[PDB]
Write a protein that binds this ligand. Structure first.
Ligand SMILES: CCS(=O)(=O)c1ccc(CC(=O)Nc2ccc(-c3ccc(C(O)(C(F)(F)F)C(F)(F)F)cc3F)cc2)cc1
Length: 222
């Protein structure tokens, strides 16, 4: 089992790398590519309908890679179809929000969007500054940890594989898989001497509440 745990760490980290949408080194190298004043004004002038359509398109692309990530998790495919859809439906966007911190630059408070970095003001046309400021603030706190790609891999696996999600039939089987991934996570943190990030992780509520507030607005504009 101790070998099982290590094989699981390697597998989880491998599945994420194959389904990480953009390479980390590419996001970091693009940080100097910042939307100009003209380009920002262009985005602020678009209709709220234009911005929602572009965001939903990009959030939907991101979700697809999160689905491919789940298909390659060790025990995800051997869960019942009902449970798979419950975990993805409740989890996919939570994982996207966590992945996004890779694309957040805490230096100048910008996120990667449509090929360049821009601030919260890019999204002004949406008319929901509170909601956008929540995404940037959440990303900022996450960025403080300097997550490695493997830490993202293991942590987002635990975001997906949550046995407390309502609507599970094989609750026992998911609680087992979560347990294994919990050990994979705590084990790799031992080996990389990064155990200190555990205390600092987001509360299980916080990711739920924030993602809830966002499916609400996007459902409206769909
Ligand atoms: C991830 C794998 S990656 O390889 O790290 C990665 C990271 C960035 C990209 C490019 C990208 O797509 N960037 C992006 C940034 C922010 C938003 C975004 C846009 C709008 C909203 C809302 O409108 C919501 F309501 F829709 F939530 C909000 F919050 F404003 F209200 C929330 C958002 F996160 C969407 C796409 C591609 C792959």
């Amino acid at each position: 089992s101790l070998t099982e745990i290590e094989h699981l760490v390697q597998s989880v980290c491998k599945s994420y790398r194959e389904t990480c949408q953009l390479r980390l080194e590419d996001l970091l190298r693009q940080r100097s590519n910042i939307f100009s004043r003209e380009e920002v004004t262009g985005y602020q002038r678009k209709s709220m309908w234009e911005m929602w359509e572009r965001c939903a398109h990009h959030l939907t692309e991101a979700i697809q890679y999160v689905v491919e990530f789940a298909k390659r998790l060790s025990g995800f495919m051997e869960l019942c179809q009902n449970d798979q859809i419950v975990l993805l439906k409740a989890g996919a966007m939570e994982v996207v929000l966590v992945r996004m911190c890779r694309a957040y630059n805490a230096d100048n408070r910008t996120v990667f969007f449509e090929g360049k970095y821009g601030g919260m003001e890019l999204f002004r046309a949406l008319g929901c500054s509170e909601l956008i400021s929540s995404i940037f603030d959440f990303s900022h706190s996450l960025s403080a940890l300097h997550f490695s790609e493997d830490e993202i891999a293991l942590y987002t696996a635990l975001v997906l594989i949550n046995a407390h999600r309502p609507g599970l039939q094989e609750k026992r089987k998911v609680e087992q898989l979560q347990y294994n991934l919990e050990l994979a996570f705590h084990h790799h943190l031992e080996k990389t001497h990064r155990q200190s990030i555990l205390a600092k992780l987001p509360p299980k509520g916080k990711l739920r509440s924030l993602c809830s507030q966002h499916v609400e607005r996007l459902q409206i504009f769909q």
